[PDB]
Amino acid sequence: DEGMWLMQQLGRKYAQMKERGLKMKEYDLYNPNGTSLKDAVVLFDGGCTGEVVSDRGLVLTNHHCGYDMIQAHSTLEHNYLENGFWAMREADELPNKDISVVFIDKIEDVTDYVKKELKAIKDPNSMDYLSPKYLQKLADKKAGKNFSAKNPGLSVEIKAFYGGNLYLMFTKKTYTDVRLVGAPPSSIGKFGADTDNWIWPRHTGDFSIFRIYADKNGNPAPYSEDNVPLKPKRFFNISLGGVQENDYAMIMGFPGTTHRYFTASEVDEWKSIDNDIRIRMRDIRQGVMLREMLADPQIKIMYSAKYAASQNAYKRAIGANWAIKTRGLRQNKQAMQDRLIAWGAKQGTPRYEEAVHEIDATVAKRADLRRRYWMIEEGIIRGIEFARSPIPTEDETKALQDASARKEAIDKIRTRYSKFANKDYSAEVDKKVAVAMLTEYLKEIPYENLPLHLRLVKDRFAGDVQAYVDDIFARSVFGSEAQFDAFAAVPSVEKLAEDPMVLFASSVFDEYRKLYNELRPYDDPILRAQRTYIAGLLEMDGDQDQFPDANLTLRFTYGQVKGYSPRDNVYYGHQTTLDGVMEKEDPDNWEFVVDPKLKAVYERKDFGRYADRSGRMPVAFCATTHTTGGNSGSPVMNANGELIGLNFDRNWEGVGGDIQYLADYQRSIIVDIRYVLLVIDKVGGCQRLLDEMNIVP
Amino acid sequence: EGMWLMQQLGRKYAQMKERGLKMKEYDLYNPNGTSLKDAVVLFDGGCTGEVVSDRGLVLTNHHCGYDMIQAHSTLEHNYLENGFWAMREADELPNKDISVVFIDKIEDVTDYVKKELKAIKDPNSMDYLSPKYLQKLADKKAGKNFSAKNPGLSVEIKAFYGGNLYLMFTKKTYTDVRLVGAPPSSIGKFGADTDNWIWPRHTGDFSIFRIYADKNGNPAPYSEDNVPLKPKRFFNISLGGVQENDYAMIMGFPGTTHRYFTASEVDEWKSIDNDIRIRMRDIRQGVMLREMLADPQIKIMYSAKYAASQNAYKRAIGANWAIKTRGLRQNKQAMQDRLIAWGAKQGTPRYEEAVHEIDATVAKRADLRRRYWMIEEGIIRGIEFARSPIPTEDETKALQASARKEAIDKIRTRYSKFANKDYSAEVDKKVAVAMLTEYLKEIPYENLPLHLRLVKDRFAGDVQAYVDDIFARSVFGSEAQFDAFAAVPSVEKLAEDPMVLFASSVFDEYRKLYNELRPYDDPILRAQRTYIAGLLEMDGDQDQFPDANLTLRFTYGQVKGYSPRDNVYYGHQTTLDGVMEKEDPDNWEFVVDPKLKAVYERKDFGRYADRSGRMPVAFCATTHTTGGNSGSPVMNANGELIGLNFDRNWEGVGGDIQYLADYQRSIIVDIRYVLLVIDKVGGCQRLLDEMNIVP
Numbered sequence A: 001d002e003g004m005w006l007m008q009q010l011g012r013k014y015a016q017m018k019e020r021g022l023k024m025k026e027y028d029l030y031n032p033n034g035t036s037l038k039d040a041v042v043l044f045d046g047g048c049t050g051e052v053v054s055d056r057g058l059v060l061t062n063h064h065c066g067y068d069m070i071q072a073h074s075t076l077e078h079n080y081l082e083n084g085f086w087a088m089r090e091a092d093e094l095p096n097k098d099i100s101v102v103f104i105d106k107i108e109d110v111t112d113y114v115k116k117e118l119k120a121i122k123d124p125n126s127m128d129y130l131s132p133k134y135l136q137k138l139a140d141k142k143a144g145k146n147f148s149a150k151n152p153g154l155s156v157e158i159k160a161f162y163g164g165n166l167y168l169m170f171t172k173k174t175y176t177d178v179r180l181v182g183a184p185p186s187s188i189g190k191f192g193a194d195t196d197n198w199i200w201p202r203h204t205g206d207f208s209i210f211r212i213y214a215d216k217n218g219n220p221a222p223y224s225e226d227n228v229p230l231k232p233k234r235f236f237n238i239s240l241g242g243v244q245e246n247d248y249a250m251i252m253g254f255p256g257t258t259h260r261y262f263t264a265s266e267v268d269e270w271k272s273i274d275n276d277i278r279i280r281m282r283d284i285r286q287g288v289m290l291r292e293m294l295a296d297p298q299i300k301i302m303y304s305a306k307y308a309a310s311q312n313a314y315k316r317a318i319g320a321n322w323a324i325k326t327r328g329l330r331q332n333k334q335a336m337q338d339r340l341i342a343w344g345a346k347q348g349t350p351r352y353e354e355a356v357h358e359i360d361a362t363v364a365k366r367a368d369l370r371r372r373y374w375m376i377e378e379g380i381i382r383g384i385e386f387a388r389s390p391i392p393t394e395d396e397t398k399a400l401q402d403a404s405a406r407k408e409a410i411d412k413i414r415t416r417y418s419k420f421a422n423k424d425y426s427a428e429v430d431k432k433v434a435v436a437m438l439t440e441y442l443k444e445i446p447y448e449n450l451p452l453h454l455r456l457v458k459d460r461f462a463g464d465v466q467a468y469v470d471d472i473f474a475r476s477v478f479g480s481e482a483q484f485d486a487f488a489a490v491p492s493v494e495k496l497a498e499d500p501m502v503l504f505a506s507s508v509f510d511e512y513r514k515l516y517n518e519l520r521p522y523d524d525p526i527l528r529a530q531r532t533y534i535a536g537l538l539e540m541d542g543d544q545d546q547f548p549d550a551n552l553t554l555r556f557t558y559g560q561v562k563g564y565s566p567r568d569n570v571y572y573g574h575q576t577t578l579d580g581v582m583e584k585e586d587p588d589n590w591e592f593v594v595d596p597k598l599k600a601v602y603e604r605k606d607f608g609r610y611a612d613r614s615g616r617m618p619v620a621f622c623a624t625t626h627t628t629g630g631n632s633g634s635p636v637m638n639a640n641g642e643l644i645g646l647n648f649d650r651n652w653e654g655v656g657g658d659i660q661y662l663a664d665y666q667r668s669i670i671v672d673i674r675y676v677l678l679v680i681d682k683v684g685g686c687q688r689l690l691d692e693m694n695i696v697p
Numbered sequence B: 001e002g003m004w005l006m007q008q009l010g011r012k013y014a015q016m017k018e019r020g021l022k023m024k025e026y027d028l029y030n031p032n033g034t035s036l037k038d039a040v041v042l043f044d045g046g047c048t049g050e051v052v053s054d055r056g057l058v059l060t061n062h063h064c065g066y067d068m069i070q071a072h073s074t075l076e077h078n079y080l081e082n083g084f085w086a087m088r089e090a091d092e093l094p095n096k097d098i099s100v101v102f103i104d105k106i107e108d109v110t111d112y113v114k115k116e117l118k119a120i121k122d123p124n125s126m127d128y129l130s131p132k133y134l135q136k137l138a139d140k141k142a143g144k145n146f147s148a149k150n151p152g153l154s155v156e157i158k159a160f161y162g163g164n165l166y167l168m169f170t171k172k173t174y175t176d177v178r179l180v181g182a183p184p185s186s187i188g189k190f191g192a193d194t195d196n197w198i199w200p201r202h203t204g205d206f207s208i209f210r211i212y213a214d215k216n217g218n219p220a221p222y223s224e225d226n227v228p229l230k231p232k233r234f235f236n237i238s239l240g241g242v243q244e245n246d247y248a249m250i251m252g253f254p255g256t257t258h259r260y261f262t263a264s265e266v267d268e269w270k271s272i273d274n275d276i277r278i279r280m281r282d283i284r285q286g287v288m289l290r291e292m293l294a295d296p297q298i299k300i301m302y303s304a305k306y307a308a309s310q311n312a313y314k315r316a317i318g319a320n321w322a323i324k325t326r327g328l329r330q331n332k333q334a335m336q337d338r339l340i341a342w343g344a345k346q347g348t349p350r351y352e353e354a355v356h357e358i359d360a361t362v363a364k365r366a367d368l369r370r371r372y373w374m375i376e377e378g379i380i381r382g383i384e385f386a387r388s389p390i391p392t393e394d395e396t397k398a399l400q401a402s403a404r405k406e407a408i409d410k411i412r413t414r415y416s417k418f419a420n421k422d423y424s425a426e427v428d429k430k431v432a433v434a435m436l437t438e439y440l441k442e443i444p445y446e447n448l449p450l451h452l453r454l455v456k457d458r459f460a461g462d463v464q465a466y467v468d469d470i471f472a473r474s475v476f477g478s479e480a481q482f483d484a485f486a487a488v489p490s491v492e493k494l495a496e497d498p499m500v501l502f503a504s505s506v507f508d509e510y511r512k513l514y515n516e517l518r519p520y521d522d523p524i525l526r527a528q529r530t531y532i533a534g535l536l537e538m539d540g541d542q543d544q545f546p547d548a549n550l551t552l553r554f555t556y557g558q559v560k561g562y563s564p565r566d567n568v569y570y571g572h573q574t575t576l577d578g579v580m581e582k583e584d585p586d587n588w589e590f591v592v593d594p595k596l597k598a599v600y601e602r603k604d605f606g607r608y609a610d611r612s613g614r615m616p617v618a619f620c621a622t623t624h625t626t627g628g629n630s631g632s633p634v635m636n637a638n639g640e641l642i643g644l645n646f647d648r649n650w651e652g653v654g655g656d657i658q659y660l661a662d663y664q665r666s667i668i669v670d671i672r673y674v675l676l677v678i679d680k681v682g683g684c685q686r687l688l689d690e691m692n693i694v695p
């Protein structure tokens, strides 16, 4: 609903934005033929958003976006992840390998051009209209001969929108010398840690600071000690006026994916297959894992990251299923398609109804296969660690069956075994997880649909899953270090070909690939029918109140700074304060430890000009803007386009917002810029960063 | 902020009127006439109730009438799960061992008691707080045969303000109190233990009884000839509901408070009582929950034991949160420093000397009190085999006449009650191993119960081996082991039994500690009499309420929510929509009654829904309540019944020491929801018809 709009759509939305509180001129925010605020927004490291906040190329993004760079520069002597990092001079800023920042220099509507090129149809069922390779050939044809060589730093890209009904060409300027400037300690940058992931109220100071470097003329250049900070076209002014309830707020960023045009049958499938299987399987896996971590402190160390990684999409699936159950997502998709079908019946065009029918029939036909795919992927591929145990390659098997190439094959198999059975791997914990996961899997998937090796549970082990799992480890070459070393001393192809763990791993990966290959053909009829479906929706209600699905391209969203009621008699306001950080402090819980410098700032009330009118220190706020994954680090703007915060998360109640925006529950979780400036100032002491920013009263 | 004596209504009336009270002072409480006070009862010795009709109908909580509902429940008529609704007066069920107490008269007898006390002689005498001594004074004042001349009536004198004020109560007790109605446990106990001490709350915590009496309305024990009581006063039911900031008041019987604790007593309560209970119960509950989650049969056997341990565990967590965040220690220190400065100015050092006596007594008993709480939480309540059978002196002087079979039958009966259908020796061994490991780390060898010295002396510090040996060799370790003993019993076998020796040794230490600690109570009590006398002489009795002591009190405040933490607000009222949001059919605690779910779907709310069409369930207020206030009537500015108190939020449990204006709330079931359940769930129209319902 309240969407993720193309920059092209700013003109037709401007009057509504102005009535909602926007004060800046249209072309100061986005001008297709000149400098605008859009020029200060970047795609940070391929998956996050960032923003230029100074005339010397300073960039703000999330702490979780700059996390890998902070970690790569951290050592036992200088742990920047734990204590933070504050370069006191430009020369002290740390270079980063494999980093990039992408500016969206120009955006052009190329729909007529692409649709004319597509008319050279050899097959009406061709998927070239969505092919990155085909669209790149069209982009290169339009840009010119050797565009990259004639315009160093620039690149051209064409993307499909609205299921293939609109095409845009993007001219991108990429910088790869992006240096680490500053970061708060992890105690501030990831205060809630995994406990507060997807949670509002939130008290996390999720920010990090970088700087774009370039050659003498401000042109992209790879890392060089001769590189100078970039003087940009445009940068954000920082506001210290703060936020109040109902204030207009807007974001620009790169939301990755949405499913706003799902049919009601696709919502049912997402719930009953994707989400229910992920929920059921991850709850079993996490339950066994948590019992083991709580019983042994060494298991807690080894499995904490694996447990946290499994919980993230588990919580998302719980939040999404809550929306399907309580917010009528299925019903609203059904009403959307019924309205198009009725309109098509009056227009004399049955193609829209035929398109929705094709989608329903394809969804109904692939149900059993998709259920088997999610069951094996969640239950075994992700669920059981020994599923990713070493499988000897065709060349490794050939090598072991007269040359020194045998010792090469054994060293390659050993390297993979050592990575599988690493310092974090527990065979005992894995056997307990596998016994619970396989018991559920064997209950859901019938004998004739099982991966060949799992048929042994009934055929050889009399249905005893524990005995089958015990036998895999007792007899396998990868069951223990001593078992691998005995194999490595006297290796034979015959031993590997009959190895119970190799056979299990090969069997489950064979079934996983067979299911993927059987399911792949069903994607194309749905994609082709969605092109007709979305064309009808656009022709009927206009490209005015229905936004194109997110596809990792630059979008804007607007709303207001506003809290919400999660449940009966409970209200979550629009703003958190430093008090909330102090209430959550737990020194014996690594997630909720409070930085001593920050604790003293709170006690002394050394808030300077960053505190609100009442003298309280703001930390974070939430807004009715429509965001998703990819929007992490996005600039949050005032009615005047000044920076008031950075988006860093969204509440679990609004995760169903990827299918249907939830006005009364969905919120973007934003770190207040006043808190960002307080941490740089009072925790980092990095005055030079404050001085180079343009701070407005 | 307080729990005021009825005598203090005159002094508080002007403030109550400015806060919204509309009723006349003597219509609420009249010392020599009929008033609203005459419709409040002490229900079954520990709860509050209220008369709501001219035929003696009484409302109280579902958890207050729980034992009576359970005693009348069978597999054929399970009233606990299905509810109970007597469709005629003759169908109302009698209850053995039940009582309702009316407070007929209250008199200040301070001068009388203090004059009688002047003839003591021993200055340290504790007769000024003795129930026996005060009863002798009560009998002397009322008359020799008072209860014979005034049937159903009895007198009682209680001390207040640490012995600085005395009141005589004339009580009328009725023991024929019949069960009339109750919602199913799914409504009466909706949150079950998960929502205990929790606001927002969606529990319809109510049950209905009726007072029966003889032909003249006089108390009489159960008789089929008994007729319903026509009371002199009953509450009118209001259907006008509540709004945020509305004046609310309660009358009831709060049991205990510690409003005059010194700062050293707050430190002791935190560092000994609460920290030990928290640490020990967390270990016990952790092992118990692991076992209940791994075996569904263990979950059935240990659910009630787990829930019983959690209740005071949660209270202790809430109390320690207040000590840590609300400055309870600091405010007590400021209170005593202000009295000490005032005493220094007046030239009276007795108040400073009294605070010093309390501090020195608290400091002197620290190690003993730590050892007491450690054994009580760690072993007496922590380990089930601590309450295993200990052969009596009569039983040992019988095994070594042929009444050896009678001794074995008595020991067998006790063994069968210890190792019952809910007892798991394996679960108990795991709990004991974790509890004793912590206990042995905290209590040094020279302070251990004699049998626990064997962990170091005989078992090389292996707690698991010591516990395994107790069960392997004990006659109470298994059924087969008991039966082998019962066939060939000898006193020598019992005298050397590892479980008997453990149980005897831990109970000996527990009693020795209790006996060593008991003498420290008296100097503190005597010093508190002087301390509270000074506080009252300095600042007066009109802000400083007397500690709760299971006597009738009133409290007033407003219907108001609160902010539990940064950016979170809990409103003043919950709705039926909140019950539906919490529904979980595969969680026995959050199952929703089908008749109630249907009422919500069809919106069959009648005259009970609010102005917006939403059905209220519960509300909260800034009244000051504690244990004993369960079932208390909640009144309007006009004295009409708007709800029943049934709980208080965990954030306000520190309110027994210091009232917490911004956090402490009484959790009340809305009377509109009570009527909705009687009407649409129970179908008991006759109960609605006999109540006086005001528009």
Ligand SMILES: O=C(c1ccco1)N1CCN(C(=O)C2CC2)CC1
Residues within 6 Å of the ligand: A296, A298, A299, A421, A422, A423, A424, A425, A426, A427
């Ligand atoms: O360090 C290793 C290891 C294995 C292979 C290379 O390093 N491990 C894994 C297994 N571990 C355990 O299971 C701990 C007893 C709990 C922790 C030690």
Ligand SMILES: [Cl-]
Residues within 6 Å of the ligand: A348, A349, A350, A351, A352
């Ligand atoms: Cl058509």
Ligand SMILES: [Cl-]
Residues within 6 Å of the ligand: A327, A661, A662, A663, A664, A665
């Ligand atoms: Cl909504």
Ligand SMILES: [Cl-]
Residues within 6 Å of the ligand: B038, B102, B230, B231, B232, B233
């Ligand atoms: Cl009466």
